[PDB]
Amino acid sequence: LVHVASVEKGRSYEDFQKVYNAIALKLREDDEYDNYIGYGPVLVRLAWHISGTWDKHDNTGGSYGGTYRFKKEFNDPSNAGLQNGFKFLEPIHKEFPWISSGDLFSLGGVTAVQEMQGPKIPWRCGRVDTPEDTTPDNGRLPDADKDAGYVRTFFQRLNMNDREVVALMGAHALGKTHLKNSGYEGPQGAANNVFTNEFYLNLLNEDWKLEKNDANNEQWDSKSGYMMLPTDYSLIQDPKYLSIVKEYANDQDKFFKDFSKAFEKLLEDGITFPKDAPSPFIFKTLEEQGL
Numbered sequence: 275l276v277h278v279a280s281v282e283k284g285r286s287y288e289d290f291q292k293v294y295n296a297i298a299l300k301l302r303e304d305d306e307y308d309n310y311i312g313y314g315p316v317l318v319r320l321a322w323h324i325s326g327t328w329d330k331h332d333n334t335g336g337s338y339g340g341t342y343r344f345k346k347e348f349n350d351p352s353n354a355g356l357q358n359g360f361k362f363l364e365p366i367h368k369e370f371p372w373i374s375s376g377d378l379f380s381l382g383g384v385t386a387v388q389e390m391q392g393p394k395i396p397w398r399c400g401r402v403d404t405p406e407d408t409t410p411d412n413g414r415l416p417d418a419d420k421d422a423g424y425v426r427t428f429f430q431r432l433n434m435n436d437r438e439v440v441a442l443m444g445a446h447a448l449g450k451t452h453l454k455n456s457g458y459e460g461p462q463g464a465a466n467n468v469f470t471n472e473f474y475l476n477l478l479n480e481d482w483k484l485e486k487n488d489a490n491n492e493q494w495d496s497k498s499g500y501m502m503l504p505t506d507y508s509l510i511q512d513p514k515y516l517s518i519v520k521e522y523a524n525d526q527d528k529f530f531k532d533f534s535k536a537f538e539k540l541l542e543d544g545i546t547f548p549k550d551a552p553s554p555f556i557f558k559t560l561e562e563q564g565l
């Protein structure tokens with residue numbers, strides 16, 4: 275399988291910046307969502323879920339085809355709750371119907387991060403919508419009641435090493451779990467929607483307690499009212515993971531750089547970029563545009 279990146283016919287940077295601006299502006303305006311968390315987190319999660327279905331073995335899945343748009347994918351239990359981000363993007367797509375889905379879902383995650391004050395993530399256009407049959411089967415996304423071994427092994431399928439895994443996980447500082455979606459609940463609330471290295475600090479700083487929740491699942495709850503998934507917690511049980519966690523807890527800049535690189539990578543997995551392809555774009559935030 276070869277997925278070659280094909281620039282939307284006749285569009286340039288400026289055309290892309292506009293879609294970005296539209297998402298951003300809508301993010302600003304719809305701030306009531308999930309009790310004032312906003313849609314940032316869910317968009318980030320959505321961009322990670324359309325991309326984490328990738329299989330470096332056979333090159334199937336990944337962000338390329340925008341297959342989330344189909345029933346199979348769309349109704350994937352691990353995707354429970356992502357429909358809200360989809361609905362959020364829907365009108366934007368309507369406004370800019372020439373953008374591919376894969377491009378849209380992915381751009382939302384980028385805009386979200388940048389608008390939530392995270393680092394700039396270079397982004398590449400060119401994803402192409404594939405047919406319904408290219409939709410990966412369910413079961414490709416990671417479970418949360420596991421440990422480091424599982425995690426390590428899991429991410430390998432996506433070509434991510436240890437530093438990449440830890441950098442990517444710091445996105446867990448955003449939003450929250452919802453009992454109805456995944457069977458986990460918390461923070462005890464409420465929540466975060468600024469991008470920072472907070473995830474690491476919490477993990478190292480709190481006094482976590484293992485407890486079962488209303489869905490009959492275990493989770494690590496802290497006195498401060500926070501929570502961590504077992505898989506989250508696992509980054510401190512593993513010696514290799516732990517030193518990286520510590521590193522990020524100490525240097526937000528380090529964390530931002532690595533996150534940036536890993537995120538782009540995650541979103542570009544499985545795609546082939548012709549030589550003639552335009553470089554990746556770095557979009558300006560609203561604020562940088564004075565909007």
Ligand code: HEM
Pocket residue numbers: 315316318319322354355416417418425442443445446448449450451452453454455456457458503505
């Ligand atoms: C071991 C790997 C992972 C597991 C098992 C995990 C699983 C989870 C779970 C169970 C949810 C909460 C869903 C809900 O109830 O709405 C969550 C939330 C979230 N995921 Fe992850 N995830 C992992 C990795 C990722 C990564 C790498 C990213 C992106 C960089 C990420 C981004 C987020 C965001 C931002 C939220 C909060 C969403 C919201 O507030 O609705 N997660 N993840």
